[PDB]
Amino acid sequence: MKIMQVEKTLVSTNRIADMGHKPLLVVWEKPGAPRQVAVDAIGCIPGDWVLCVGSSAAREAAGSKSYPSDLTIIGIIDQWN
Amino acid sequence: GIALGMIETRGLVPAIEAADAMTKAAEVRLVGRQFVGGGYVTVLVRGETGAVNAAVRAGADACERVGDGLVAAHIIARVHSEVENILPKAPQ
Amino acid sequence: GIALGMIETRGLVPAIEAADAMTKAAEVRLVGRQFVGGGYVTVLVRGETGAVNAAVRAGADACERVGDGLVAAHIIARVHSEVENILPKAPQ
Amino acid sequence: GIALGMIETRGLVPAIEAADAMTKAAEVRLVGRQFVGGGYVTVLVRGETGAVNAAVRAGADACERVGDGLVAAHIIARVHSEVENILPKAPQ
Amino acid sequence: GIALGMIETRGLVPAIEAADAMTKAAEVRLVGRQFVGGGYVTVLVRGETGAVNAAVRAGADACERVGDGLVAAHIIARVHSEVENILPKAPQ
Amino acid sequence: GIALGMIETRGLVPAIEAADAMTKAAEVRLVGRQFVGGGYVTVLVRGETGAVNAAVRAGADACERVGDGLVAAHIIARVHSEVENILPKAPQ
Amino acid sequence: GIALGMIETRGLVPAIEAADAMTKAAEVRLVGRQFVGGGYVTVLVRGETGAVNAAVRAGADACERVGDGLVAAHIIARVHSEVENILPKAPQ
Amino acid sequence: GIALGMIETRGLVPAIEAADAMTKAAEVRLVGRQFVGGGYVTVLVRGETGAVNAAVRAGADACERVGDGLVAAHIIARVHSEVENILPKAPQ
Amino acid sequence: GIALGMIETRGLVPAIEAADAMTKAAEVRLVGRQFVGGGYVTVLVRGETGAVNAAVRAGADACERVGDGLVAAHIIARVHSEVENILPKAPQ
Amino acid sequence: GIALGMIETRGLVPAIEAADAMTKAAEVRLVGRQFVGGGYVTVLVRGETGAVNAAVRAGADACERVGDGLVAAHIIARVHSEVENILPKAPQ
Amino acid sequence: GIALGMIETRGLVPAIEAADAMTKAAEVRLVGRQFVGGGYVTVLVRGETGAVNAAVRAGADACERVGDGLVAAHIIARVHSEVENILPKAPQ
Amino acid sequence: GIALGMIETRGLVPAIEAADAMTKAAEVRLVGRQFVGGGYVTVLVRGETGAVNAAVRAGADACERVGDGLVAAHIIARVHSEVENILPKAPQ
Amino acid sequence: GIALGMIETRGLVPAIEAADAMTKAAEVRLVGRQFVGGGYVTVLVRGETGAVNAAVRAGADACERVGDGLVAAHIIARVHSEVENILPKAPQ
Amino acid sequence: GIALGMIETRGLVPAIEAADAMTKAAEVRLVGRQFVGGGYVTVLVRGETGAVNAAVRAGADACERVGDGLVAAHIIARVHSEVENILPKAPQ
Amino acid sequence: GIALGMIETRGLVPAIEAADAMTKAAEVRLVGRQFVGGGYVTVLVRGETGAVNAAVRAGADACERVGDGLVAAHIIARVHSEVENILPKAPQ
Amino acid sequence: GIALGMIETRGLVPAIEAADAMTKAAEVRLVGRQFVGGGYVTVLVRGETGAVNAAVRAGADACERVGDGLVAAHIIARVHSEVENILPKAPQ
Amino acid sequence: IISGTSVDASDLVTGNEIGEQQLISGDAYVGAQQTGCMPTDFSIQTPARSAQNRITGPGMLATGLITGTPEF
Amino acid sequence: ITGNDIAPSGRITGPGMLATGLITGTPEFRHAARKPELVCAPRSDQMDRVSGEGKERCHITGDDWSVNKHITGTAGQWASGRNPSMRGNARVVETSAFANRNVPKPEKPGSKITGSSGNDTQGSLITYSGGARG
């Protein structure tokens, strides 16, 4: 897993139907780091340090073994920084 | 903390049992009691995530066989700045 | 008397019967009556714990066959300080 | 008066018939009409024990076939002094 | 009290037995004796509803077999303000 | 004395004979005579209970074959203070 | 009102029952109670045609089984101007 | 008067019924109530002879079926002066 | 006179009857009335042996069928001086 | 009120239950408790005839199965002034 | 006289006869007459042992067929010095 | 405390056993032992509602087979304020 | 000497016999004798549990066939301090 | 508070749960936790009889599903002063 | 006294009940409590032989169905002087 | 942190595994290790409520199949002040 | 067999014969030869005990005669 | 009861001959005292004559522009019979892309080509010059 802070939300209307009705959140390892996007399996508010799982694990953390997700927020860190 | 525990019940007796249990079982603050209509009463508590998880668990168990029972017991770790404005700040 | 007794009922006639039986059975003070909604009414009484037990056992028996009847009869012997804010507290 | 009479009905139209049948029947005062919630309306009358006895029997017989019907017809010949705080004094 | 009690009889001797019985049995005031015509005498007793019930029952049980007998024993717990103008306020 | 003796008769002739046979027979005072209507006349005699009982039996036997006949012969041993108003207190 | 309702009854007790029922059943005014003779008492109300119908029908039901009962119950929706002279203007 | 009526009963509830009946029926004075023992209560009245006969026939009928019953109902028209020492002069 | 006559009865009404009968029947002296307990009352007379024998025979017949009845009728022509301590000197 | 309702029971436990049941059920005041003897205890209340009717019904049912039980239940709508002397005014 | 002799009887008349036969049959000293309640009367004698035996056989034969009868005849030749506290010393 | 527990028995020996079991089981106070007559002895205890429930349960079990036994074990968590004037404050 | 022995008997003769047997049979002091009403008398002893268990056995043997008999033979090995107020002191 | 409430558990985790549940359910004092051995741990609380009843019920429910479980739940509403030696005054 | 009574139980709750039931039951001193291991707890009492026989039976009945129950209830009336060393003198 | 996690095991090897796993899972402080008796060993940690919840869940999984197994894993987020007296502060 | 001076009844002796054959209880001062040698309830009957150790009043009279406002 | 009768009758039509058995508190009641699952029809089980705002699948109650069989005029024979018409017998084949959807087609081109060519045999039929699978 990686510790990434939520920066904002992302919205793709043309997203594949396999993504389902699942929120997507821009994330980064620090402010200024490359911005990734993760399926928000938990409900995370912007500014939340979060735990993000990579491929295979992220597909079942996002709801199905066949889910199109290589990144998913599996939790919010009780306290970081 | 900014976590939310909500325990909806059918009636206010299960809600008051749910809110006693939640408040005695963890360091959470009862922020509101809402009458929604149709005999649904939501007791909402606010505190750090672990406290809210312990509290919601105790409350659900407590209010389950009291009266018409538990409709829902739900934990929200972090609550959006927008959901804050639909949430009672202090109990009434 | 910091114990609490509560009797939820379907309708108000059952609840006034409960309040009356409760305050006639034991040394309990009627603090409040509430309209939950969906036809639910909650009468709440406060007194020493044994007194509240006797009062709520007698109220339930009296209100059980009046109207649509008893929904819940509960005793919380020590209410948490937080729950006091969501409780009527109005004999006066 | 000291005696309380109460007719609970499912709907206002059955209750207005009971209030009229009760007040016409004997010397009782309509002290309240309450919308409990969920379509339950209670009509409350305070008079002497004999009048309240005769009145509540008149109301129950009148409203039983009116609308959805009667939920309850109860006489409390002397409510506890504590139950007075949760009883209306004048209809609104 | 406003409840009215009334005993019509066939003669004044059964009526006087009824007035005596009613007055002795319960706390009722004798408001009048009326010669209706045809040998019918009415005795009207105004008091509280339980009192008037006791009075009318005692009067009927008394005058039932004296003389020609009892024609009617009736109670009207509240009389309309119109029926008052045809009721004697004091006996003669 | 406060006992009352009453003889009801069909007509005036049968009641002037009963009134005469009464007052002669025992120590009673004729307090009055009333035309009830419908052909009934009531003669009333106030004395002690022992005297009034002799008088009523005398009057009853005296008028039972005079005229149309006797309707009622009634003794009251104490009259309530309120029947006193419906009774003729007459120099007559 | 211009309509006339009338209930004749055998005695005063059935008539007071009729007057009470009639005058509570609709907006009619008791204008007279008349001792006709022979033990017939007639109660008259003047109201709108609809009130008199509701009222006379109510009075008939109330006195039918009280005392010697009802002789007649009749409605004249408009009395001739000349019949008004033979009719009472307020009760005695 | 100096005649003596005495009603014994199995209890004070059948004795108070008898005292009320006796002291309303005739011009008699309640001179005493005595608790004999074994549950026997005696209500003694003093009046003229006819008065006491009437009172003691009124008392007996009344209490015959109130509580455990009537044991005795006895008139003594004259009492030796010796017996007056064993008799109550007032009911306290 | 030194002889004792004693009538025990079940109740006081038969005892008063026996005391009157005894005092009237002979020259005995009503010397006391005793409430034994269990509803037994003993009347005691003192007179000459001829007087007491005459009195007790009359008292036995007088109170045999008054109230509950006679328990004992007894005559002691001479009482030992020791026994006179447990005998009432005057009635109370 | 001047009515009199009275319950006789076999023992004190049933009677304290009757007095409590009655004084909880209606607007009556407990005026006396009497130990008749031989295990009869009479509890007496004075109130209005409607209140006493409601009070003695509830009291009789309450004490019927408590201890040895109910002997008598009895309402006197009007007590003669003479029976007031043998009637306790306030409980001792 | 340290022996005690005791006869218990159903009533006072057998007890007085027993006290007479006991005190005249031997040199005993009558010390106590107790109403034990329920219609039990105990006459107690105190004399030498032979005197007491003779006295108690004589008392028992004397009061066996007087009134309700003899419950017990019992001699105690030496009484413990502690039972002498509960024994009366002079008949009252 | 204000709860009242009452154990009636047949004799003082079953009531001293019941009083010992009551006083030892919970923190109650013997407020009076009563001789009602007839053999009935009532043991009245006043303590908190929890204590009185425990005490009367212990007392009823203890004296059930002792002597003539238990008539009634009865708890009133709060008597009316008028039922407290017929309650003993201290044992005699 | 803290244990209590208690013999209830039907009469004072069986009780005095039991008292004698108990006091003679073991080291127990006779503390009191109580008349309970209805013919029950209770003889209480106070001593050690063996002294008392031996006295109450000896006492019940004495008074079983004396008079009307023994009702109860009970031993309380330690008496609660509260129950000592309802217990006769030793000068009795 | 002098009532004791003791819960016995198999293991310490159920006992700490019971202590917490008992101390939070009622105004009771945790007086001690005893390791009885064989994996039995007793938690003892002390407070008024109602508080101890509530606390023990709460503790039992709470510990019934934590670990090996509840062996006992007991109340001693009054505790002998001898047992205060084997009872722990303060948790340590 | 030097008698030893010894209740043994599975757990401490049954043992505190036994100790308390043994101390309230008779004049005995709780001399110690032992945790023997394996769940076993032994309460030991010392007093005269009958005191101990009545305590060890009260204790056994009290704790028989409390907790895991009773293992042993045994009385030794005199213990050898060598067994006094393996016996505690005062509780700890 | 003041939250209490605790894990009980059937032995010490499962307990050490739990303590190690709990201390390693989250920032919690191992405050005590207890030999309850019978082979029950309890490990207790104190930390922030979320940390303790994380610790106890990981400890229980670690020791479930280690040795004879796990008995209990309990989290108490708010511990009562009274229970903190029976909780260790530093391990031994 | 109690030998010695006898205080019992004899054929020759008179004046000691009232109640000689009566069963008196307590100390036996006379031989069982003449006197000889479970009571369960009080033998005195009481008015209360004779009857095992509904509401009457003016509401009870005129059961079907009266008409008018009913009460319940 | 006699005289002027204003009680409900079946000979005098008007506003008091309606709600018979649904009205309580009338002199008669006081004397005696002594549907579709969905508002809108199923979408599959109906086809509307005029779609859009002319739809009649939902049941609008009230005064609503619908017309009983009693009422004549505007549509029906009053729009249908005005002009004479003869419907001839010429229902003929549609030449269209949709009618040619199930035309007979020649055997599908296949590929025996080897080597790396992106030779997918599972997608839509791409074709090269001469109808050669591509």
Numbering used by the authors:
A (entry chain P): 1 to 81
B (entry chain H), C (entry chain G), D (entry chain I), E (entry chain F), F (entry chain D), G (entry chain E), ...: 6 to 97
Q (entry chain X): 615 to 651, 685 to 700, 712 to 730
R (entry chain Y): 702 to 735, 770 to 869
Original authors' sentences:
Among diverse BMCs, carboxysomes are specific CO2-fixing BMCs found in all cyanobacteria and many proteobacteria. The carboxysome uses a polyhedral protein shell to encapsulate the key CO2 fixation enzymes, ribulose-1,5-bisphosphate carboxylase/oxygenase (Rubisco) and carbonic anhydrase (CA). Carboxysome shells are typically composed of three groups of structural components that form hexamers, pentamers, and trimers. Here, we generated recombinant α-carboxysome shells of Halothiobacillus neapolitanus by expressing all the shell proteins (involving three CsoS1 hexameric proteins and two CsoS4 pentameric proteins), together with the C-terminal domain of CsoS2 (CsoS2-C) that mediates shell assembly.
The cryo-EM structures of T = 9, T = 9 Q = 12, T = 13, T = 16, and T = 19 shell assemblies were determined at 2.3-, 2.99-, 2.93-, 2.75-, and 3.04-Å resolution, respectively. In the T = 16 shell, the identified CsoS2-C regions encompass almost identical F1 to F5 fragments as those of the T = 19 shell. Intriguingly, the smaller T = 9 shells involved only one conformation of CsoS2-C, whereas the second conformation of CsoS2 appeared in the larger T = 13, T = 16, and T = 19 shells. To visualize the existence of CsoS1A/B heterohexamers and prevent symmetry-caused biases in the process of differentiating CsoS1A and CsoS1B in the shells, we also analyzed the structures without introducing additional symmetries. Fortunately, the density maps for the T = 9 (C1) and T = 16 (C1) shells were retained at good resolution. For the T = 16 (C1) shell map, additional densities consistent with the CsoS1B C-terminal helix were observed at the central and terminal regions of the CsoS1 hexamer. Although building the structural model was challenging at this density, this result confirms that CsoS1A and CsoS1B can form heterohexamers during shell assembly. Collectively, these results imply that there is a correlation between the size/structure of the shell and the incorporation of CsoS1A/B heterohexamers and that CsoS1B is probably highly abundant in the larger shells.
